[PDB]
Amino acid sequence: DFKYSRELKLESLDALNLTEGIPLRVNENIDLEFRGIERAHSDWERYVGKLNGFHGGRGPQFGFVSACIPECLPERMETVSYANEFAFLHDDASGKQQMQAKLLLEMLSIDRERTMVTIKAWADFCGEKFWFGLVTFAMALSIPEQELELVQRLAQNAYLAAGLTNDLYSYEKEQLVVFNAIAVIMQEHSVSISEAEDICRGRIREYAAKYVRDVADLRAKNELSRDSLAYLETGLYGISGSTAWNLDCPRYQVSTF
Numbered sequence: 521d522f523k524y525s526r527e528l529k530l531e532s533l534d535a536l537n538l539t540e541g542i543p544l545r546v547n548e549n550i551d552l553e554f555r556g557i558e559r560a561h562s563d564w565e566r567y568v569g570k571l572n573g574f575h576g577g578r579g580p581q582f583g584f585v586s587a588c589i590p591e592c593l594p595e596r597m598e599t600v601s602y603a604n605e606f607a608f609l610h611d612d613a614s615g616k617q618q619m620q621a622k623l624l625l626e627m628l629s630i631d632r633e634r635t636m637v638t639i640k641a642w643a644d645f646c647g648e649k650f651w652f653g654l655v656t657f658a659m660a661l662s663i664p665e666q667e668l669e670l671v672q673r674l675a676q677n678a679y680l681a682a683g684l685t686n687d688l689y690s691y692e693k694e695q696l697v698v699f700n701a702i703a704v705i706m707q708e709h710s711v712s713i714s715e716a717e718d719i720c721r722g723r724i725r726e727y728a729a730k731y732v733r734d735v736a737d738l739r740a741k742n743e744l745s746r747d748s749l750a751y752l753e754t755g756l757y758g759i760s761g762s763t764a765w766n767l768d769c770p771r772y773q774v775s776t777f
Contacts, residue, residue, distance in 0.1 A: 524548060525590030525757075530764055538685055538721065540728045542760040545590035546582045549597045553583040556601030560609065563622070567615025573777050575770035576608035577601070584769070585658075587761030589754060592658040599626050600658040607650060608771075631660060648672065648679050655754055661747040671748045674734055678755035681727035682762040688720050689766040693774055728759055 525545040533539050547553070557578055565571060577584030585592065585601045592600055603623055610616070627635040638653035652672065656663065663671055687701040691713070694700060705716035735752050738744055770776055 522591060524592065524594055525586075528764075532767065533760065533764060536763070538724055538728065539760040539763050540725070540732045542728075542732065542756045544587065544760045544764045545757045546761070547586035547590050547592050547594075547597065549592075549594045550582050550586050552594065552597035553586045553601040554578065556598035557583065557605045559598070560602045560605035563619050564606070564609050567618050568609070569615075571609070574609070574612065575773075575776060576605045577765075577769075577771075579765050579769040581768075582765070584761070584765050587765050588758040589655055589658045590757045590761065591750075591754065593660060596630060596658050596660075599623070599630065600654060603627075603654060627657065631657060634660060634662065637662075647683070648676065651679070651758070655751060659750060659754065661751055663748055663751060664745050667744055667748045671744075671751060674731075674738075674752060675755050677727045677731040677734070678759055681724050681731060681759050684720055684724045684727070685759075685763050685766060688717060688724070690772050691717075693772050693776075696774065697777075731755060731759070 522545070525547050528544045528546055530544050533544065534541075557576060560576075561571060561574075579587075583601065585597070585604050589600065606619065606623065624635070624639070627638065634657050638657045641649040641653035641656075652675075655661065684701050691698070691700045691702040701720055702713060702716045705711065705719050706713070709716070709719065711719075735756060738752060739749055742749075766772060
């Protein structure tokens with residue numbers, strides 16, 4: 521039931537067969553997303569430190585957030601984008617808590633109850649729970665507590681598909697600078713990079729196909745809450761958006777350092 525996003529023809533995903541047949545959707549407010557990325561970089565330089573050669577969720581045509589949370593509420597896009605960009609920077613001391621406080625104040629002013637759920641998920645660390653806090657806040661979703669255990673267990677497949685794809689597309693630039701799936705497969709099977717890569721692709725397609733099927737069944741049954749279903753359906757655009765973004769995003773392009 522789409523109100524804020526747009527489906528994009530990107531025929532290379534069919535040839536790549538990593539996202540099953542999940543379409544690419546992109547939030548139409550890419551401009552707000554970039555504004556929140558710029559502000560996060562301005563605050564980081566202001567409070568934390570200088571940034572040189574850093575690239576986060578910005579891609580040449582769309583950003584990470586607009587492809588992966590395509591139905592993100594427009595008035596929440598900047599904040600959601602800022603928080604995603606800040607998590608990218610944090611992953612790569614007084615100012616950090618000052619930036620966090622500001623972000624917390626902006627979130628509480630938008631959605632008090634759902635900022636608390638989100639913060640709870642973000643204190644645990646597990647990257648599952650970061651994306652869980654961000655998506656639920658970005659789309660103003662309230663997962664019934666009786667459904668949470670089941671919803672999170674189901675979403676794990678989409679997190680694995682996107683997580684492994686990420687490592688697949690980040691290994692090259694990461695090696696040039698390992699805690700990557702390609703390296704583990706190169707230990708266990710003692711194989712070359714391209715052979716670990718083909719094994720990784722097999723696993724990605726398993727996880728992706730299982731997720732697509734489960735979400736189809738749950739949607740067809742309509743016995744879970746609309747917010748749980750909306751969260752799970754966002755899991756699908758997170759797989760297609762992650763992959764499409766990975767193709768050309770500066771973060772993983774060797775052309776940068």
